[model samples]
Target: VIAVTPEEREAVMSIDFGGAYDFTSPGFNLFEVREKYSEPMDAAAGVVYNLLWNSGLPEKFGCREQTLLNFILQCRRRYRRVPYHNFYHVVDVCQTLHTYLYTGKASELLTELECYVLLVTALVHDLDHMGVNNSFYLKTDSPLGILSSASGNNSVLEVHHCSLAIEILSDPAADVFEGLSGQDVAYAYRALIDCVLATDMAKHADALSRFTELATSGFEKDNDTHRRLVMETLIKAGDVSNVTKPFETSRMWAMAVTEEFYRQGDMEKEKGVEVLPMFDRSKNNELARGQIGFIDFVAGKFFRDIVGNLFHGMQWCVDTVNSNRAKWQEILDGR
Candidate 1:
């Protein structure tokens, strides 16, 4: 369980939640979040709070707005100073999840509670990320790697994020599900854990396969397993939703993640470990080519098959993914 000391709680309470920024404004552009809020933590808080409020979770769950804001602020503070996995990345994911639910018509497929869990999971999915992928930790024989080895878990970072989320929720004052009890509470926790862990890229193939299997069998709401699988797939889609965004937004995220991967590659080289060429900063010029390959091999297919096939109304996401892929291909051909 997470513990918040009196001093820390006092500090959190001192924060001003009422700012000039309008988080609830219609058609909120997440790209302008940092500019509007100025403070990264505040930006995160505002986005999350707005989503929660819009979802009607505060009233339904008997949760105080300030308590939810405090929880979000605390969660933001835990994110490491990383290029891609920072608080901004999580907030971006949350906003992307919002788009998927409201704009992409995923809201029709999921209940309000399910939507709430997905948004919250997105917010804390990469909590405390060390700016490196699982391979880096495993190769360096780091403590987290050793722990992952001992636990026999390949998705080390995903599991760590789950633990940190539970810790944060341990503080009742900051608990968004404070009024929930028994099975209601259990369901929320279970959904949160599953959704967050599903973001592990190492499990991408298996997740896609499971989604395919379920989609082929037909989605049945009465089947708890099917519903859970849908939730998992939805969260995974949100995790990589940048590809479905406009070309400029997608390009920006591609650069951020590439730079992050390049840093990891640099560390691998310094340690005499086998470095992946795509992560090599010296080959940065190949970024456009790599993105094209990624779209064709991974993002494009997933959006088309899993998301579009399941949610027919969201075919626009696939269209945008293809559009972005074409733009990247043009860059590759030097057009």
Candidate 2:
């Protein structure tokens, strides 16, 4: 069962672990290796490897080393080489989620199993994004879109990703949760699926509202629902966390997302669907406005409310978002 190709296998094994990089730290910036990594995919795979191993989930869950590697290779194969929502994006999200769990102190609210599922969920969140949003499918009346519509589930990509996740785990060689049994197996599936589904932007405001209410209402300890809410919010935090990255890294991410959006917009035009101004490359000139708008209206308050009320340990996320907003404003003014 060669889930990993020989080339990818050798490339991943070739990475020297005794390097200057600190993939486990909160201050870890992905852009440092964004353009620098000789093999970004393998680098990302290695990061995930380290995350699982460093967190001690392997032995804790009785996961075999070979299965762990197979799981990663299986995941890497599923991710398309898209501009934004590729394997690298998942790696970034997984790392950011790790920071939220530990450095952000959100881990205190979750169990070891919960954290384990959370990290795995992050990797599978956007398993096969086709460089387009759900709107593309729905508007184009595409196959998956119509299927999703008929199924009455709004999150097309998320549900597809969930199915793909289960498919990966069906292969015992790729099942990281192989050691889990009974109720925990149930918990793992629900946690993984729910959190991944929560990444859908369509449900963003509603999710933030619920989590905000939980924060305002005071997190009820020992409440399974409460734990789920926090888990959902944390993953959501990692999903839109590009705004919370360092300025240079944030800028690079912005360019990548904008490029993907524009590519989708062009496809939309060909399909005769409505193209939002933000996605339309012909419409927007300076991308700074979009970043500033996201930070001011979306990220800043989201992080502030989460950090101030719930995740006090992630204050730096809010702080960096504000500074990133300021930097974007500076770019706007300079232009």
Top TM-score prediction, candidate number: 2
lDDT per residue (tens digit) for residues 26-136 in model 1:
234556556555454654556677667767866687778767776787788799877788887887777777777777777777777777777878878988998899988
- List model 2 lDDT by residue over 212-321, tens digit each: 89998989869989999999999999988999888888998999999999999999999998999988989865789988888878877789888988899999898899
Error of 1 at 278 (Å): 1.3
For candidate 2, give the lDDT of residue 237. 91
Candidate of highest lDDT: 2
Candidate 1 residue spans exceeding 4 A from truth: 1-28
Off-target runs (Cα >4 Å) in candidate 2 are 5-7
- Whole-model lDDT values for every prediction: 0.78, 0.87
Poorest lDDT segment (10 consecutive residues) of candidate 1: 20-29
